[PDB]
Amino acid sequence: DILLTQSPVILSVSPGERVSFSCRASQSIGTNIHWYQQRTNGSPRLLIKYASESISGIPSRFSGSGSGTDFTLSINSVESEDIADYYCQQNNNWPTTFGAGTKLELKRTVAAPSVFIFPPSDEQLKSGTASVVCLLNNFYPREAKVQWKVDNALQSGNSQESVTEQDSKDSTYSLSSTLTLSKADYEKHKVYACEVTHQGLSSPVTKSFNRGA
Amino acid sequence: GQFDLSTRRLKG
Amino acid sequence: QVQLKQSGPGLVQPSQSLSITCTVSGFSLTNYGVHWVRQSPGKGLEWLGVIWSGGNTDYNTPFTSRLSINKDNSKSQVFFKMNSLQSNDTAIYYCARALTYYDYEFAYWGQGTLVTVSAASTKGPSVFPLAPSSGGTAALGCLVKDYFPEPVTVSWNSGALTSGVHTFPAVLQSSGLYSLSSVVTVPSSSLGTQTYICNVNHKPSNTKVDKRVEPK
């Protein structure tokens, strides 16, 4: 099988800049290479066929070149909607094979998160489990810290984080931090606090509630 | 570098 | 309008077999081959096989003995079947169609079918409100907890509300069950006028829940 090597693993640029993806084949494949774009939760989308040929409905800022073993996919002026992974495919030799992909990330100005805290619903408390959710919305860059405190006690190991991929329009991330307690433990305490640290904040922001009001 | 089934995106 | 629509995601027990149906429209199976491609954490994008216009099939080498592709031209359906699945067969499976009838330039894809190979059992989620509470922008959401396997679809107000929506990637709990939240930001002034419903659908368990989310 032909081995296709894509580089780099991750690309990070600013909007309006040009960007290139490399795809190298373990042996000559003429111009028999195709390129695909994969957005978050999407199926692959065909960008270029046979190294350089246009595809209907694909914006003109996408192009490709190369022959033999060294191939290049280019975006001459990147837009936020280009946030995706990019794969090459060879079909000079059976079976057709794909590269491992390059990730394209977009830079943008620092944006501080908007922080919200959600107490557990009474509905969930009926089940014997309490979930406390802290939301960090529309921020950049991705790095952030969530510190949980229950009655001034540092919580450790009983929370989980999930981060969205970059937004295709404003290039921000959003983060959810979920603190899970047994209903018994939740009823034995009062002050539930989420503390958020981020480059866009001059001070850590704390959202809290007292069980009840 | 690996495909993540939750997001259909490359992660590490 | 060329389209390919696959059957729903689901669970297959280890050593058991996988069946996916690909229904096409906008073209005829008698004029085009239909390819099958999967995408897994282990091996990334992986071409599995193809059934050509005239009924012939090609299978990628490591799948010759456990792969079977059939079709019904009249019904515009292609049937994919793979035997003896193991854990690393967990992947998203796509059917795809090339630009020309003989080629491999995949310009049209199905929406994909996430197949989870596990011995565990299907479990529907519980949906809990993330209620807004007291700069004119309120955040609210739904907690979609304790389901298996992936995935679950979440939308807001039956598709009418998409702006400001964030549906977070699911996370695996120590219980072996998944959980996720879906949030949305809206104007505070609309909380007394507009209804906010998250529409949750866990196809592997046929669990559909509409959860109204109100200020408490």
Author numbering:
A (entry chain A): 1 to 213
B (entry chain E): 1 to 12
C (entry chain B): 1 to 134, 139 to 220
From the paper:
Multiple strategies have been developed to modify monoclonal antibodies, including chemical conjugation and protein engineering. Recently, we identified a cyclic, 12-amino-acid peptide that binds in a cavity formed by all four IgG domains of the cetuximab Fab. Owing to the location of the binding site within the Fab, we have termed the peptide a meditope (medi-, middle, + -tope, place). Based on our observations, the peptide–Fab interaction does not affect antigen binding. Herein, multiple crystal structures of meditope peptide derivatives incorporating natural and unnatural amino acids bound to the cetuximab Fab domain are presented.
Finally, it was observed that substitution of Arg8 and Arg9 by citrulline dramatically reduced the overall affinity, presumably owing to lost electrostatic interactions. Thus, the charge from the guanidinium groups plays an important role in the overall affinity. Attempts to reduce the charge of the residues in positions 8 and 9 resulted in weaker affinity. Interestingly, the change had a larger effect on Arg8 than Arg9, despite the fact that Arg9 forms a salt bridge with Asp85 of the cetuximab light chain.
